Amino acid sequence: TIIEVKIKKLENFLGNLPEYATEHSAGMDLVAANEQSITIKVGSIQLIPTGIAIALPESFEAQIRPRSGLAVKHGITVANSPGTIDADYRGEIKVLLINLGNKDFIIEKGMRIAQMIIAKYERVLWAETSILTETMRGR
Amino acid sequence: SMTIIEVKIKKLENFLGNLPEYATEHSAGMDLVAANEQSITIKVGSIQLIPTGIAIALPESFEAQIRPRSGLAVKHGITVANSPGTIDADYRGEIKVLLINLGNKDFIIEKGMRIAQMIIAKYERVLWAETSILT
Amino acid sequence: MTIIEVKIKKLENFLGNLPEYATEHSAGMDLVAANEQSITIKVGSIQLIPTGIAIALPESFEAQIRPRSGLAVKHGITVANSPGTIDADYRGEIKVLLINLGNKDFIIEKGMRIAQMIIAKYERVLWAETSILTETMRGRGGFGST
Ligand SMILES: O=c1ccn([C@H]2C[C@H](O)[C@@H](COP(=O)(O)O)O2)c(=O)[nH]1
Ligand SMILES: O=c1ccn([C@H]2C[C@H](O)[C@@H](COP(=O)(O)O)O2)c(=O)[nH]1
Ligand SMILES: O=c1ccn([C@H]2C[C@H](O)[C@@H](COP(=O)(O)O)O2)c(=O)[nH]1
């Protein structure tokens, strides 16, 4: 199942629109679009802009997830993972990276920093009740 | 088209105010609100479990995901330690949010603070097919 | 509910039971450590733990590697690249990247439950490049908004 998503390139965008590595990949690589280098000191969190804004169709969301390689090699991961991009968000997509490694890490424009996976969500209608069914799991 | 799924929800004794709400009509998730009666300090490097005051019964083939909110992470280094937390359709206990302070100042969690977002989605039940060669 | 068949290969270090759902309505299966030498995760360190299985997902399905809440609560151990993303293109050994954000060193021994694996559908995006996106209510009137 294919979904069309509108996407706007911002002033800082470069290159191809976010790409899937292979034809069956779940996620697109997000690329740092910071106009000046950003150093993430050990233990710190930095916001990295991506230079895109998107308009997801109704009932969909985008998830900002880590690239395993950055975590393995440098202890860099997504601080709010999985980051939720809502279908009515019209701002620049931002990636929050934390440095949990042992050396300061420089984020340069063009680096692959996260992946973005699009998935369906369901909107909840609450049915308030005073008792829930019992299950084999329980409380 | 969005689709609606009805989910049963029980208020526990420590719930205050309103059932979890979508910030906007097109939000993927509902905001989860701290329901601790007494403030909870999360010191630098600590993990703390925060109650929400609710229990839910998801319909079959659905799960709920406990995810961080952007503000707590970027402003305070607070995030969800077991993210994304998985709420199973047969869980009948209180939903709790496990926060970690990876920032550089102690942070006090007060009743009423938005501490996470909860996204409901379908999952698929796997039947394994054992094989000797993956194509 | 909806059942999906997934092919799975036992590698040489596989010990015993294929990943199982803890209950008939659990979203995820428990993944178990299959390391043939003990692995110590020092405080603040990150270690890759093998599971001894490889899988072949059907198209449009992913497996998400997520933390078990018990390990996080009791030991500060969680999944460093969470949610780990397994898709149809990955037929190698499933590995769990753990980080120790607790207050003492933690030894991973084979047979320990280390993560849970939730299979779900994802969508493939085709981009419609545009110069004007619709306006919405989100963030409207906030400080600094243009
Ligand atoms: O990693 C993230 C998370 C969120 N957002 C955007 C899209 C969301 O709709 C909006 C609000 O996020 P929350 O505060 O609800 O997490 O910020 C990002 O750009 N990056
Ligand atoms: O962030 C979380 C994760 C889990 N749970 C509840 C619902 C789950 O069904 C149950 C068991 O979680 P695990 O041990 O499978 O992580 O705990 C929560 O309240 N919050
Ligand atoms: O928790 C994880 C995440 C990924 N992978 C597999 C599937 C991916 O295709 C491959 C490389 O990881 P990424 O660089 O795409 O994150 O490793 C795992 O074994 N476990």
| Side-chain half-sphere CA neighbours of A27 within 13 A | 27
SS3 assignment, position C70: helix
| CB contact (8 A) between residue C129 and residue A7 | yes
A127: how many CB neighbours lie within 10 A of its CB? 11
- Whether residues A98 and B102 touch (CB distance < 8 A) is answered with yes
Cis peptide leading into residue A66 (ω within 30°): no
In order, the DSSP letters of B80-126 are ETTSSEEE-TTB-S--EEEEEE-SSS-EEE-TT-EEEEEEEEE-BEE
Q: Write the CB contacts of B111 (distance below 8 Å, at least 6 apart in sequence).
A: B16, B33, B34, B35, B36, B37, B39
Instruction: List the binding residues of A for substrate.
Output: 67-69, 80, 84-86, 94
Q: Given an 8 Å threshold on Cβ–Cβ distance, is C25 in contact with B88?
A: yes
Side chain identity at residue C48, one-letter code: L
CA C138–ligand 2 middle distance (angstroms)? 30
Q: Which residues of A touch B (CB under 8 A)?
A: 43, 45, 47, 58-59, 61, 79-84, 86-88, 94, 96, 98, 100, 119-139
Answer whether C71's CB lies under 8 Å from C112's CB.
no
Closest by CA position to B92, among listed C22, A129, C73, A135: A135
Q: Which of B56, B44, B50, B46 is nearest to B20 (CA)?
A: B56
- Residue A54 contacts residue A10 (beta carbons within 8 Å): no
Give chain A positions within 8 Å (CB) of C127: 4-7, 17-18
Cα–Cα distance, C41 to C100 (Å, whole number)? 6
- State the virtual CA torsion across C106, B102, B108, A83 in degrees, nearest 10: -110
The shortest CB-CB distance from B79 to any of A80, A136, A138 is to A80
Question: Which residue of chain B has the CA closest to C81?
Answer: B83
* DSSP H or E segment with residue B63: strand B62-67
Q: Count of CB atoms within 10 A of residue A89's CB?
A: 23
State whether C7 and B83 contact (CB < 8 Å): no
H/E element, A106: strand A105-107
Q: Which of A46, A42, A62 is nearest to A96 (CA)?
A: A46
User: What three-state secondary structure class fits C96?
Assistant: strand
Angle at alpha carbon of residue B83, lines to B78 and B84, rounded to 5°: 135
C39 Cβ neighbours under 8 A, 6+ residues apart: C33, C47, C49, C107, C108
Using an 8 Å Cβ cutoff, are A99 and A44 in contact?
yes
Indicate if ligand 1 lies below 6 Å from the C-beta of A30: no
Give the integer Cα–Cα distance in Å for B118 and B63: 10
Contacting partners of chain A (3+ CB pairs under 8 A): B, C
Cβ atoms of residues C103 and C72 within 8 Å: no
φ, ψ dihedrals at C70, nearest 5°: -60, -45
- Which one, of A113, A116, A2, lies nearest residue A57 by Cα? A2
Residue nearest to atom 16 of ligand 2 (CA): C69
Confirm or reject: Cβ of A64 under 6 Å from ligand 1. yes
- Separation between Cα atoms, residue B101 and residue A19, nearest integer Å: 34
Query: C81 vs A88: CB contact, 8 Å cut-off?
Result: no
Distances (CA, A) of B134 to C19, C58, C123: 18, 12, 24
Strand, coil or helix: C75: helix
> Side chain identity at A11, as an amino acid letter?
E
Q: From CA C34, how far away is CA C11, in angstroms rounded?
A: 10
Full strand arrangement of the beta sheet holding B47-51 = B47-51, B96-101, B78-80
- Best CA proximity match to B46, nearest among B110, B84, B98, B117: B98
Technique used by the depositors: X-ray
Burial class (CB in 10 A: 0-12, 13-18, 19+), B66: buried
CA distance B128 to chain A (A): 20
Torsion of CA A73, C80, C88, C13, to 10 degrees: 80
Among A9, A81, A86, whose Cβ lies nearest the Cβ of C138? A86
Residue with tokens 């109704």: A58
